């Protein structure tokens, strides 16, 4: 994990080129690259606090996309203006196999719109709950992709802050694509916002301590645990009870967990920041070189050359069988511009 040879220099090279590309787009964001009327709206794929994600068809090309719709007035009420500007500014600038791609963004009088690649395989969440739990080899396959994605994001000074099965879509190759950057932030040093999902919050977030990218690595610990066990390491009926468990410093593992998996998780679910994997001198390499990942070929994973655990069912284009059904609601566009100043850079 401490070794610095040829392999680590190839990674550096890749990340250096990646940052060059990202910074150009970060400093000069794309804006207003489509219009609502260019899309045929088909069906709701999911919902959040500010609006919904809908399956759409682009009229001029016939391509399907997933269009995230945010109501500007609701974003303001929830005090998510800056977070929403973060989300779009970051998404239009990044480029990685395991991140859902932003194809277009635009806004009208009422709403903000981010048109993303449609990932037809559904949420990992759906598959995980249905099958109960993943085998360790299957969990490892998914986990490896998140490790590389965080290595990428963190190198760009980005923190992701909402890792969970709900935000991981399975594509037609059986690989993961991360969605929802609503809490992603570019920060060098410390930040303090209380955000995320209760089950996945690191101790330092709960205790209002000021934190950094180490919270993403704690969250990876929670994700791997939930994938392999079928339930989270800290769960209860109410968030407050979940937080008490998270800060207690105690964690129990299923008896079927291998000793290697348990060791990795004890190092990720580490309340002590000076001891948490991903946050030490060796950085992500403590994770990449852990025995649990000994069979993982990181390059082959990135190149999508490794055989996936499963390929989602596919009944032609536009099929949404892998997604739950949601109550449909008509998109209304006011005749007056709302919150123009607040979202001017969007």
């Amino acid at each position: 994990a401490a070794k610095k040879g040829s392999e680590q220099e190839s990674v550096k090279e890749f990340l250096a080129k990646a940052k060059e590309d990202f910074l150009k787009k970060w400093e000069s964001p794309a804006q207003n690259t489509a219009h609502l009327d260019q899309f045929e709206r088909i069906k709701t794929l999911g919902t959040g606090s500010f609006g919904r994600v809908m399956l759409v068809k682009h009229k001029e090309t016939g391509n399907h996309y997933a269009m995230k719709i945010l109501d500007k007035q609701k974003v303001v009420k929830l005090k998510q203006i800056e977070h929403t500007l973060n989300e779009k500014r970051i998404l239009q600038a990044v480029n990685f196999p395991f991140l859902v791609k932003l194809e277009f963004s635009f806004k009208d009088n009422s709403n903000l719109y981010m048109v993303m690649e449609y990932v037809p395989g559904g949420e990992m969440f759906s598959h995980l709950r249905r099958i109960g739990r993943f085998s360790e080899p299957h969990a490892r396959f998914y986990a490896a992709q998140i490790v590389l994605t965080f290595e990428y994001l963190h190198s760009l000074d980005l923190i992701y802050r909402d890792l969970k099965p709900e935000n991981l879509l399975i594509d037609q190759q059986g690989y993961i694509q991360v969605t929802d950057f609503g809490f992603a932030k570019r920060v060098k040093g410390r930040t303090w916002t209380l955000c995320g999902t209760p089950e996945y919050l690191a101790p330092e977030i709960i205790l209002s301590k000021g934190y950094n990218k180490a919270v993403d690595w704690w969250a990876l610990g929670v994700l791997i645990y939930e994938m392999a066990a079928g339930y989270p390491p800290f769960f209860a009926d109410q968030p407050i009870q979940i937080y008490e468990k998270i800060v207690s410093g105690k964690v129990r593992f299923p008896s079927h967990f291998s000793s290697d998996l348990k060791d990795l998780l004890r190092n990720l679910l580490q309340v002590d920041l000076t001891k948490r994997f991903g946050n030490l001198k060796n950085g992500v390499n403590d994770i990449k070189n852990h025995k649990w990942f000994a069979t993982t070929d990181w390059i082959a994973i990135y190149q999508r050359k490794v055989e996936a655990p499963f390929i989602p069912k596919f009944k032609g284009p536009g099929d949404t069988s892998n997604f739950d059904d949601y109550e449909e609601e008509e998109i209304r566009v006011s005749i007056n511009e709302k919150c123009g100043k607040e979202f001017s850079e969007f």
């Binding site: 209380l194 769960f235 009926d237």
Partner: peptide, 20 residues
Amino acid sequence: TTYADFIASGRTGRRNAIHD
């Protein structure tokens, strides 16, 4: 079992983000 306790809990559905 821990699994049974989870399945009987109120948080087996999609979990919302929090914000303060």
